[PDB]
Structure 1
Amino acid sequence: QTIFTEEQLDNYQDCTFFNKKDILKLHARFYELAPNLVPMDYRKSPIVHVPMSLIIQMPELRENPFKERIVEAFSEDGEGNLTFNDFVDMFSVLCESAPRELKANYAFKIYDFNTDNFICKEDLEMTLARLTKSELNEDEVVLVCDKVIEEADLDGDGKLGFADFEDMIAKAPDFLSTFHIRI
């Protein structure tokens, strides 16, 4: 194996929930998305981006109702054209070993559709509509979010801060189901 140096694999294993063997598997998957873009030899730390449009076609992501916003969350400019490091970071957050609070950190931002660092009724309607995959129509989503937003708003300001959100998802773990993706 001459794709990575031993120090690179040490760092990857220490900074993610993957073992070295997993890292080599992830490089193969990354490389297969775009062999003309991705070096087979990473020992000099090349900098390459694979477009979001290719990443969201992987079978592990393509059915996820938040696939674009998940991939964008690990990109510098929010466009989801990931480096290998970004790609590894994202599947480490998504893996079985990652703690709930790490998943929650990314989920809060991905569900904060109007980017004001709280979850309001309207953020929650857009989130639930995607989570329920056409099982619920527009007003059925309203019905649900009406009751959730009051129950979950512990502090009393009409919106959910990150603490409210973490307490919510501890009781209703299905809000994090889209952040459990094995690769």
Structure 2
Amino acid sequence: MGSRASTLLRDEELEEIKKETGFSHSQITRLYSRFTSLDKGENGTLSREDFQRIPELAINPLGDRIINAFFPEGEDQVNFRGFMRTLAHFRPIEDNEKSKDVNGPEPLNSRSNKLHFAFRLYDLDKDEKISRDELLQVLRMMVGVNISDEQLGSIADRTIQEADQDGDSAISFTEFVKVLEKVDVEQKMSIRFLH
């Protein structure tokens, strides 16, 4: 019955997602069985009502990230295909790492993929870029923690108005790409917490 529950990412939940983007052993295959099992008992795809079964989405301030991380606003179920494409999209760069000949360069977590990823997360309306209603919903939930109301309203309007590089009063791929030329965030998209 009821209990303290209180989940936690122990070396088991970490090692699992870690090998998902770190490797591809069975440690994750099993993790997909329980996760995908949340399908009320389907065991094939996952819908919004299933992700909430985890204490992360039900406690996330935006979660528009997890929601669009498994599938955009058009499908009602994410198959095992994206299950591993999303949780693994955090693989550390190892092909374009200055080298030009590894041994297994697969398309995943690449530059163009980095934008496509952070994009799906902020791409709630699918306008092809982060609109102001989307960017603001997050930007505000990320600074509202200590920003007044009229202060946030003016910090959000100037934020999307000053970064507006495509001039679409929206962003996702352009000033983001221009920003990577200053910071290799592509490798940052990797969980480790080791050193």
Report the TM-score range of the alignment, normalised by the length of the smaller protein.
Answer: 0.5 to 0.7
1:164 Cα offset (Å): 1.3
The 1:55–1:143 alpha-carbon spacing in structure 2 relative to 1, beyond 3 Å, is same
Question: Equivalent residue of 1:78, what SS?
Answer: coil
Whole-angstrom CA distance in 1 between matches of 2:58 and 2:180: 24
The 1:133–1:172 alpha-carbon spacing in structure 2 relative to 1, beyond 3 Å, is farther
State the match for 1:164 in structure 2. Answer: 175
1:34 Cα offset (Å): 4.4
2:81 to 80, 85, 108: 85
Whole-angstrom CA distance in 2 between matches of 1:68 and 1:106: 13
Residue by residue over 1:88-112, the C-alpha shift from the partner in whole angstroms, topping out at 9 and shown as x without a partner, is 222122x463567634323224324
1:68 Cα offset (Å): 4.7
- Matched to 1:75, the amino acid is F
TM-score (norm 1): 0.58
State the match for 1:53 in structure 2. Answer: 49
Residue by residue over 1:65-108, the C-alpha shift from the partner in whole angstroms, topping out at 9 and shown as x without a partner, is 34355334533763452222232222122x46356763432322
2:35 to 25, 30, 36: 30
Instruction: Confirm or deny: 8 A CA contact 2:45 2:80 kept in the other structure.
Output: yes
- Matched to 2:81, the amino acid is N
The 1:150–1:133 alpha-carbon spacing in structure 2 relative to 1, beyond 3 Å, is closer
Question: Equivalent residue of 2:59, what SS?
Answer: coil
TM-score (norm 2): 0.55
RMSD: 4.0
Whole-angstrom CA distance in 2 between matches of 1:108 and 1:172: 17
State the match for 1:129 in structure 2. Answer: 140
Higher helix share: 1
State the match for 1:74 in structure 2. Answer: 70
- Matched to 1:90, the amino acid is T
Whole-angstrom CA distance in 2 between matches of 1:61 and 1:96: 22
1:105 is aligned to 2:116: yes
Structure 2: unaligned runs, 5 residues or longer: 1-19, 93-108
2:153 to 138, 142, 145: 142
Whole-angstrom CA distance in 2 between matches of 1:87 and 1:75: 9
Using the aligned pairs only, state the percent identity. Answer: 28
- Matched to 1:108, the amino acid is F
What is the count of residue pairs matched by the alignment?
155
